[PDB]
Amino acid sequence: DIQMTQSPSSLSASVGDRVSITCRASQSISTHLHWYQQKPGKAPKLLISAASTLQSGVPSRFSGSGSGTDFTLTITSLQPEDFATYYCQQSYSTPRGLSFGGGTKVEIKRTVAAPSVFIFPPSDEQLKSGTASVVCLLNNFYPREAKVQWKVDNALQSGNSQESVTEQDSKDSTYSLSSTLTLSKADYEKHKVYACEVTHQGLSSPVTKSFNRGEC
Amino acid sequence: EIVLTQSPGTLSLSPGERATLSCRASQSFDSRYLGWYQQKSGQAPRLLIYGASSRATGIPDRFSGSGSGTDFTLTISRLEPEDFAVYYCQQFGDSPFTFGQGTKLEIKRTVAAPSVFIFPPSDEQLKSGTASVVCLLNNFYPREAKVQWKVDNALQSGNSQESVTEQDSKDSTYSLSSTLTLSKADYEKHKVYACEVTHQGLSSPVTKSFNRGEC
Amino acid sequence: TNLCPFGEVFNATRFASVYAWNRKRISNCVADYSVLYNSASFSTFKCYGVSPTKLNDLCFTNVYADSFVIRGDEVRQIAPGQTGKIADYNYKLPDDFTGCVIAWNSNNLDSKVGGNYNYLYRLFRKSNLKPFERDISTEIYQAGSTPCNGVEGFNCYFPLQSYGFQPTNGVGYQPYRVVVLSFELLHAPATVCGP
Amino acid sequence: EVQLVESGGGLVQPGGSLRLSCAASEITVSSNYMNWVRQAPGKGLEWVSVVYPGGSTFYTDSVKGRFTISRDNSKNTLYLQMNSLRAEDTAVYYCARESGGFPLAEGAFDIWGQGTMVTVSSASTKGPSVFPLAPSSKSTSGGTAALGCLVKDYFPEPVTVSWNSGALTSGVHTFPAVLQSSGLYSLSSVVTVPSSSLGTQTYICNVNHKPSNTKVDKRVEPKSC
Amino acid sequence: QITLKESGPTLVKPTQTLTLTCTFSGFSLSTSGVGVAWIRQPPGKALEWLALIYWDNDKRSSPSLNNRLTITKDTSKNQVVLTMTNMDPEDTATYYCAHFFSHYDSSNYYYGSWFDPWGQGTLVTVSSASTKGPSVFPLAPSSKSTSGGTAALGCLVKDYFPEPVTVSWNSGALTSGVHTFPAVLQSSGLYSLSSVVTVPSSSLGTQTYICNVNHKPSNTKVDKRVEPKSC
Ligand SMILES: *[C@@H]1O[C@H](CO)[C@@H](O[C@@H]2O[C@H](CO)[C@@H](O)[C@H](O)[C@H]2NC(C)=O)[C@H](O)[C@H]1NC(C)=O
């Protein structure tokens, strides 16, 4: 029942920087800890074994240290291909206690960019079949941290919002976000105003985007 | 291997106040693997704390220890005149077992002005082919002092040696001897020899000179 | 008189590794199990086919004492019907086992401040061991299709691995000394039994 | 040529059964510690089962009594039989070798397979519906306009969305699909284009779904308020 | 209460071997958890652990020096012998043997371990030289009248080998303001120290000062008189 906690959850670094990741166990596990690296869509690859031993075929920049209840993985010079997810796995519990860590993700660091906000009310084709979907879109923002609130005719909404986010793109290394409300047409026709409030680090004040159904 | 760095290198206080010493480890090991030792002048080390927090038998309550991760500390509250020595941190976590570089605990006093005394080589030495000129700095605090030998107003370098005595037990001061060695051909080829002292307690550099022809 | 020499087994200066466990024959003596059972130094005293208080009455043809040192968390594997690395490749007990198992913590004796690496166990083996079977072969283990000729490499490993006993290890990875007693009552006249 | 290849994943109803195979090359299944490890979509790794060189088998508590791990020496294969499957078993399964590596990493997985996907659902496979999202009524807005498509109510994954038969690629974001409450899936695909291009260029939206053989093409055009 | 004592030839010629013996009393190498360790300290430098031997004949050595270190134990006569081969001139140091023990509490919990009592330590010098007598030179005081009623004088003790040298003043009857700086090793493998006594200016001619130097390895006893000299 040994559980492993990884710190931090995510880490932003640039090319040529030094990076350190920590793995902590609820009880001492001696040196029975291993470090794996996984890239999206692929199987994990073993990097470090016994918390200190480098595996053959692994670049020498990776190193590991620690013992007892605290362990660390260090990358000295971060090449552009080292942006992946990293896991710590213990082999201390003898019969059936094998467990992995939560995982730490590494992404490219850059400046701050303010998202562009667009809104799409439901279409008449959608309303032919009795569906209502209202979609608010944020484009090209960094960092990923942003929050969106939904206002139905100037009242708070909760529980009817689905949110999706895109991974860092290969040319500008930013993210995109799309939020949607799903409702029935009876829940739509009664109200008149709808709005999405978006708040981001690069925004001086929260930005609203609203539409009134009666006018258009 | 594991490298242990002690902080600070030298720590000077008066009898009565509190002293704090730090030992930092390159790697991370269990806290039960670190101990503290004390060594006086011309003696053998004695165990002072083991396990980073457990006192040895006979050690007074003044000494305390506490640490974790990669940093450990030793504390003395009421230090007496017999508490001034060198202190080492030692680890058993990983072979080979290593000690710290040491930290000296020095008694603090008022600043003293060094006194300079000159000595040209004597006949018993100026007959044997080698001559040694020596000047002495006496009764100065703190330990730092700068010595410069000059021959015919030319600054010598690499041909002299220095010796410092231990902190004097009654004045908490120091004495320093500077020796410069040459041969007879190197000796009788110049006229006036001097040494210069620079110190915190001296407002200006002090140069003491002697001419072999006159005296 | 002529009491059985149980002091030369439990109080031995050094023990054997689990893959090369030690076996001792006890016969032609009188055995007092009361001192063994009433001792408070034993963490595990477990037995199955006999009643622990009735050992002083039963009389057997001979006794076997098997001794070794293992990890703290693997003591549960020294029992009939168990599975694991120790039970499958190091020391196997029969399902109809008679006799019993004693185990105690020996952290102060078998741990060294820099690490003790003198105790080994087998990790690689093609098949399970028969009960009470010993294997001390140290030939290179082939894990692939290309046969290596005695040189270690990618898919050819030395089959014995060392424990990492160390005084700061938690309870579970600290050394434990284990003695297993097996009682044989044969058609021959009984020889080992107490007052 | 050390290699592990998985096969046999797919979609089953809750309470169904499945069989996964792992074919090995250059390593002998009967001579190594062989493990099955699963990863849920977006979650971390989780150990499932192990088989020893001598034949002993071990399972985690979640799957005990429902999963069975087996070997085959003639074909050099590993097998996982799964019974009474449930929605929590939807994941990607990996066949892995334990305690290998050149320095003999004990307890670590050094060789992994590609993985195979197992989906457990009762969603009654059906094809996606496409709804246009027309750019809003704005003249220039700094030379930035956005239009897109919404793909709703389909099962199962995946689905492929393309614009103008692949003639437009710049500024296209296809958001990952999200599993909605009814068990179906939805996603959106948007593109940012200059406002002056909204009148001349013709915009085609293509959505292709293989399991339902649903292929839909549509046109996105601004409306007048 | 236990004691440890070091013994052996303190003078070693270069690239031969040294053998040191530690004799201990108050404990025996038959108790569990008892060890004997060897540590060394160069003059003015930090301590360096050399070797360790246990009660069960288990031994540990520094990996950098494992090639040329041997350690043996004799329990009957309570001795531990350390042998080092291929000696260098940078291995001159002071060698200690120390008692090693650990702490457990009836459940084997290990509250740490230590190097409790150390030996007196023996000074070992490794160089190619010959024992020769010291030469003393009188550093007479400056030809000064009063200079505030304070002057100083003394001796320079040059060209002696090996260490140490015992220097006294006025047969030890004078101990006020006597400073004898530690001897330094020169570029020729040869030693030299000083000895200075501070005296009042008016006392230059009324009291005759003698500096006495004694050197056991060369068995040299020299008394040098110091008096002021003029220009
Ligand atoms: C192993 O040795 C220990 C100690 O030498 C024995 O324990 C002692 O047993 C006697 C009984 O005859 C007691 O009086 C002592 O107090 C015990 N000492 C300790 C420290 O426990 C133990 O009996 C021996 N075991 C065997 C099987 O002979």
Residue numbers in the entry:
A (entry chain N): 1 to 216
B (entry chain L): 1 to 215
C (entry chain A): 333 to 527
D (entry chain M): 1 to 225
E (entry chain H): 1 to 231
What does the original paper state about this entry?
Omicron variant is characterized by significant mutation in its spike (S) protein, which is a major target of vaccines. In particular, the receptor-binding domain (RBD) of the spike protein has undergone more than 15 amino acid substitutions, altering both the transmissibility and its recognition by the immune system. Two bnAbs, L4.65 and L5.34, showed ultrapotent neutralizing activities (IC50 ≤ 10 ng/mL) against almost all the pseudoviruses tested. L4.65 and L5.34 were mapped to RBD-5 and RBD-2, respectively, the two major antigenic sites of bnAbs elicited by ZF2001.
To explore the molecular basis of their epitopes, we next determined the cryo-EM structures of these two bnAbs in complexed with S-trimer of prototype (resolution 2.65 Å), Omicron BA.2 (resolution 2.75 Å), and BA.4/5 (resolution 2.85 Å), respectively. L5.34 and L4.65 interact with the inner and outer face of the RBD, respectively. The footprint of L5.34 locates at the typical RBD-2 site towards RBD peak, largely overlapping with the RBM, while the footprint of L4.65 is at the typical RBD-5 site beneath the mesa in the outer face of RBD. Notably, the identification of ultrapotent bnAbs, including L4.65 and L5.34, highlight their potential as therapeutic candidates for the treatment of SARS-CoV-2 and its variants.
